[PDB]
Amino acid sequence: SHMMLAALKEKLAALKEKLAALKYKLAALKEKLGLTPELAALEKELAALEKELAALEWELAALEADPNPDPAKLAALEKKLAALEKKLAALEYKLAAL
């Protein structure tokens, strides 16, 4: 469980850093391309993924505090973070395609 928790925290931190970088890239594209509806949809998505990462971090905080973290809850968190990473990758592509 300890190794699992360490890997999940490292994954969470990595996605948080990517999130922030894309926020600055999106704002730069808004100033270069204008206030386009495509960018509005990407901004909506980035904001939702930011809300989800914050909620997942509360979940990880609880599991790290638990002296006997539930392995199934740990495995399910890995899957949620992997799903979020896929969405963040799809958003990063779209920003790089503008």
Numbering used by the authors: 19 to 116
Question: Which of the paper's sentences describe this entry?
Answer:
Here we describe the combination of rational and computational design to deliver three-helix bundle (3HB) peptide assemblies and single-chain proteins with control over topology and thermal stability. First, we garner sequence-to-structure relationships from antiparallel 3HBs in the Protein Data Bank. This gives core-packing rules, including layers of hydrogen-bonded polar residues, which are combined with surface-charge patterning to design complementary sequences for acidic (A), basic (B), and neutral (N) helices.
To alter thermal stability in our designs without compromising the 3HB fold and topology, we sought to destabilise sc-apCC3-CW1 systematically by modifying its consolidated, largely Leu-based hydrophobic core. As a control, we included a variant without a polar layer, namely sc-apCC3-CW-0NTT. Variable-temperature CD measurements revealed that sc-apCC3-CW with 0, 1, and 2 N-T-T layers were hyperthermally stable and did not unfold upon heating. Specifically, secondary structure calculations from the models all gave ≈74% helical residues.
